[PDB]
Ligand binder design. Structure first.
Ligand SMILES: *CC(=O)[C@H](C)NC(=O)[C@H](CCCNC(N)N)NC(=O)OCc1ccccc1
Length: 215
């Protein structure tokens, strides 16, 4: 809070998951952010369900993509603020199809009351993150299929196409960076994670930053 913050070292982040063939990155970003926010509201870290959004959120488009802000407003406005546990509504997409929504046989693992959209400014996004926790962001991920590790320092920044989770930053590094949780298993990047240079809107990281609010 300045200097460096890694929310992984504060027990606030669940393991890296796998979206597979589904275009559900939006749901991973939105849920990942909720999981962290719920913990930080003084609740035990619980794995929550992306499948609930992919199959039940009809404000977005399942395996064809969607937006984290729409998912946040669907939870509040349509699902009474409920977020089911991953355990009671396990990921069933992956082959690239979303089975139909089942409205019962699930347990509420978390509830949100709304969401805030953060300024398009990295210094301000970092200020909020430092105190309030992980933020969901949209990024141009064009370069990311060849990311093997290290802090990227140069990234194609032409079109926002992927949703991810910002879990920290370190401005004490030789090149300050952001640390991002991705959803392409642990086999990609630094054990599922990516580090990009902070301060130059790499991969357009400041353009659509938002977060769920609990309580
Ligand atoms: C990461 C993915 O899995 C896929 C296939 N794409 C999406 O989820 C993108 C991510 C966000 C990209 N661009 C932004 N400006 N945020 N979503 C997408 O393009 O969603 C579109 C959409 C819009 C309105 C209603 C339904 C769907």
């Amino acid at each position: 809070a300045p200097a460096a913050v890694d929310w992984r070292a504060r027990g606030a982040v669940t393991a890296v998951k796998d979206q597979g063939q589904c275009g559900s990155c939006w749901a991973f970003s939105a849920i990942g952010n909720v999981e962290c926010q719920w913990f930080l509201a003084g609740h035990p870290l619980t794995n929550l369900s992306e499948q609930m959004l992919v199959s039940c959120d009809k404000t977005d488009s399942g395996c064809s993509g969607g937006l984290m802000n729409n998912a946040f407003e669907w939870i509040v406005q349509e699902n009474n603020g409920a977020v089911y546990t991953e355990d009671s509504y396990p990921y069933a997409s992956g082959e690239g199809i979303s089975p139909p929504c089942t409205t019962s046989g699930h347990t509420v693992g978390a509830t949100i009351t709304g969401h805030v959209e953060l300024p398009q400014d990295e210094a301000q996004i970092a200020a909020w993150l430092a105190v309030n926790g992980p933020v969901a962001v949209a990024v141009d991920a064009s370069s990311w299929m060849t990311y093997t590790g290290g802090v990227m320092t140069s990234c194609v920044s032409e079109q926002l196409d992927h949703g991810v989770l910002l879990v920290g930053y370190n401005d004490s590094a030789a090149v300050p960076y952001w640390i991002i949780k991705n959803s392409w298993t642990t086999q990609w990047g630094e054990e599922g994670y990516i580090r990009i240079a902070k301060g130059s809107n790499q991969c357009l990281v400041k353009e659509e930053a938002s977060s769920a609010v609990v309580g």
